Amino acid sequence: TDLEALFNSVMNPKPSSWRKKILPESFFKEPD
Amino acid sequence: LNWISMRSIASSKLWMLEFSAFLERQQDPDTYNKHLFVHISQSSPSYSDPYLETVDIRQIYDKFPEKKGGLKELFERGPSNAFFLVKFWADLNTNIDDEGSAFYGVSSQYESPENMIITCSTKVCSFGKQVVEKVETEYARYENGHYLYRIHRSPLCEYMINFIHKLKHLPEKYMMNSVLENFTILQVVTNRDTQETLLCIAYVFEVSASEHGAQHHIYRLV
């Protein structure tokens, strides 16, 4: 009886999205 | 201490020598396994070394606590040179938790010019809001013209191990990073007697693309 999870996604607003923020390029490029 | 605070995690008063989160199991009387989820070991910076890349603090307010007692409040108030943001590419590849229970804990080392008592508050944050908060008080030792402190083998709380468990038991890595998008930790180190903020590090995560090893990047908040 945990079909409720199907709802979280339409119900429950999305987060701020990291990639759209103003940051240095290196932030998403993992290093070697 | 100020030539380092542009290149390492350090304010004018405190500098973090090492940071480590790990899982350990003693396979044998003489053999042991230690796996490090994340590790930092910058204890010998040089003036030649390049400055860290700055990050606008306002950008990161969302993923960390807000309102009263939060980051804006702190940064606004505390010494500016003490705020750092770190991104970790964790290495989750380990088996030490299959059978025979392991040990999970974290450790760190700090250095100070001045002798003090430092209070370390660590908060884990889901979708910005706070879930768990641990506090530890560490005391100094004189060594080499300066003072030394440490968090040694601190036991990771149950919530933490569980989180790793679910995370590690996952099919694809992107499903991992996705979950990691909304999980962050904020650690604040304060001078107990005077209440000044000596170090504030904000941690954000991603899982390593590479089969083996972990990585990190450090930025100085502004």
Residue numbers in the entry:
A (entry chain E): 26 to 57
B (entry chain A): 204 to 425
Paper text:
All four molecules of TEAD adopt a globular structure similar to that seen in the previously solved YAP-TEAD structures. The structures of all four molecules of TAZ reveal two short helices with a short loop of 13 residues in between. The binding interfaces for helix α1 and helix α2 of TAZ and YAP to TEAD are virtually identical. The only difference lies in the position of the loop between helix α1 and helix α2. As the loop of TAZ is shorter than that of YAP, it adopts a downward position, while that of YAP is in an upward position. In the second binding mode, we observe two TAZ molecules straddling two TEAD molecules in a heterotetramer conformation. Instead, the loops of the two TAZ molecules cross each other in this conformation and a hydrogen bond is observed between Asn33 of each of the TAZ molecules.
Formation of the YAP/TAZ-TEAD complex within the nucleus leads to transcription of growth-promoting and pro-survival genes, thus promoting malignancy. Herein, we report the crystal structure of mouse TAZ-TEAD4 complex, which reveals a distinct binding mode not observed in YAP-TEAD complex.
